[PDB]
Structure formats: C-alpha cells, structure tokens
C-alpha cells in the first residue's frame, strides 16, 4: 500500500536458489527486471555449479509475486507489495505426483532499489529415473491459477495450485503447490480476500550462453473478484 509505491515502474530483480535434490547439489542464479503495472516480469537465470540436475521447468514455480498486476479494483487485496520493504518469506512444499516432493524456503525484500528472491530448496524421496531425475518433460508454457487465502494467526496467507507437466511418453507429471507467506517486518500488511493470480511464461534459451540456463517472460494478473 506505501509498499506499492516501490513497484510503480521498472525494478531490478536479484534470484539466489540453493538447491539439494537427492543429494544433487546445485545453485541458480537469475537477474532481470519486473514491472508490476503490467504484471510482466523478465529473468535470465543460470545454473552455476554446471549442469541442474532437474529439469528447468520444475524450478519455474520457484524461482516474486510482488510484481503481479493487481487491478485497482483489487487493490486492497495484494499482500505481497505490502510486507514490503521488509519482505516475506514464502515456503513451499510440492509434490511430484508418484514421485518426490520439493520443500521451498525464500525471503523475498529489497536490498536497496534491487528486489531480492533467496531461496532454499530440498528435494527428496525422487526416483532416480522417475520424469524429474530423469528429465522426461516435454518442458511446455506453463500457465495456471493461484489460489490465494488469507492466514490471519500468521498475518500473512496461504496459496495452492496444480502444474501440469506434460511427459514424453503422453503422460502428464501433476506437481501439486502448497504455499504459506509470512511477512519478516512487524507493520500492518493487507490481508486478501479469497482471489487467484493468473499466471502465464514462456521459456527460451539464450543461444551465446554456454552455462545451463533458463530465459523466462513471464506475466502475472490478480483476478476473481468483480468490478
């Protein structure tokens, strides 16, 4: 709400992802930039241990919906511009359908003009040669609605959703996402009615990058509730 008002033009964004998937250790970096006036975000990101071990499109989900488009009408409604500066953090528990489950802590917060994801990441239970370890995804646009709820013992709120991932042999990886946000600082934060962020990106590569990587337009639009 005074929080929003860091987000009226072009900001800088700073990704940091520590990551562990059955022992399979590895960091991310991205960097780009966000504009939540039009809810778009874009990102490059790099694997900078060598190659990620998961497909990219697992991680998509985890690697700042503080830059959604909330429609002025919805204003009121948008918890995550205002926990800032101070931030939130977001957790995260998703499971792989048949397979392994991600456990996800991040602290989203300025650092300076500069919006800052760093997060931690566990992986366990996955099957060696399940879709996840073994890279079966027809990687696809990736679009959805996030279920958002408010969490008043927490201040904060609670969030689910369904990805669907589409498979090489016809079949399709649910990664069911289960989300809690808390805000770090004590001021008063907007506490949302029921709505959802519809949530759309598309992935590409960047042919001169040599390094395992992920480029990623993304937008992101609160919606639900009339007028």
Same mark, same amino acid.
């Given at each position: 709400?005074?929080?929003?008002?860091?987000?009226?033009?072009v900001?800088?964004?700073?990704?940091?992802?520590?990551?562990?998937?059955?022992?399979h250790?590895?960091?991310?970096?991205g960097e780009?930039?966000?504009?939540?006036?039009?809810?778009?975000?874009?990102?490059?990101?790099?694997?900078?241990?060598?190659?990620?071990?998961?497909?990219?499109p697992?991680?998509?989900?985890?690697?700042?919906?503080?830059?959604?488009?909330?429609?002025?009408?919805?204003?009121?409604?948008?918890?995550?511009?205002?926990?800032?500066?101070?931030?939130?953090?977001?957790?995260?528990?998703?499971?792989?359908?048949?397979?392994?489950?991600?456990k996800?802590?991040?602290?989203?917060?300025?650092?300076?003009?500069?919006?800052?994801?760093?997060?931690?990441?566990?992986?366990? &239970?996955?099957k060696?040669? *399940?879709?996840?370890?073994?890279? =079966?995804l027809?990687? +696809?646009?990736?679009? @959805?609605? !996030?279920?958002?709820?408010? &969490?008043?013992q927490?201040? *904060?709120?609670?969030?689910?959703? =369904?990805?669907?991932? +589409?498979?090489?042999? @016809?079949? !399709?990886?649910?990664?069911?996402?289960?989300?809690q946000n808390?805000?770090?600082?004590?001021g008063?934060?907007?506490?949302?009615?029921?709505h959802?962020?519809?949530?759309?990106?598309k992935?590409?590569?960047?042919?001169?990058?040599?390094?395992?990587?992920?480029?990623?337009?993304?937008?992101?639009?609160?919606?639900?509730?009339?007028?």
């Amino acid at each position: 709400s005074k929080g929003e008002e860091l987000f009226t033009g072009v900001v800088p964004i700073l990704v940091e992802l520590d990551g562990d998937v059955n022992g399979h250790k590895f960091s991310v970096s991205g960097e780009g930039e966000g504009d939540a006036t039009y809810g778009k975000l874009t990102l490059k990101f790099i694997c900078t241990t060598g190659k990620l071990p998961v497909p990219w499109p697992t991680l998509k989900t985890t690697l700042v919906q503080c830059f959604a488009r909330y429609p002025d009408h919805m204003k009121q409604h948008d918890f995550f511009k205002s926990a800032m500066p101070e931030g939130y953090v977001q957790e995260r528990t998703i499971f792989f359908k048949d397979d392994g489950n991600y456990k996800t802590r991040a602290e989203v917060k300025f650092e300076g003009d500069t919006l800052v994801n760093r997060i931690e990441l566990k992986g366990i &239970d996955f099957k060696e040669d *399940g879709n996840i370890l073994g890279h =079966k995804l027809e990687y +696809n646009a990736i679009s @959805g609605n !996030v279920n958002i709820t408010a &969490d008043k013992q927490k201040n *904060g709120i609670k969030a689910n959703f =369904k990805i669907r991932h +589409n498979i090489e042999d @016809g079949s !399709v990886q649910l990664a069911d996402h289960y989300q809690q946000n808390t805000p770090i600082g004590d001021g008063p934060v907007l506490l949302p009615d029921n709505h959802y962020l519809s949530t759309q990106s598309k992935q590409s590569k960047d042919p001169n990058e040599k390094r395992d990587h992920m480029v990623l337009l993304e937008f992101v639009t609160a919606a639900g509730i009339t007028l």
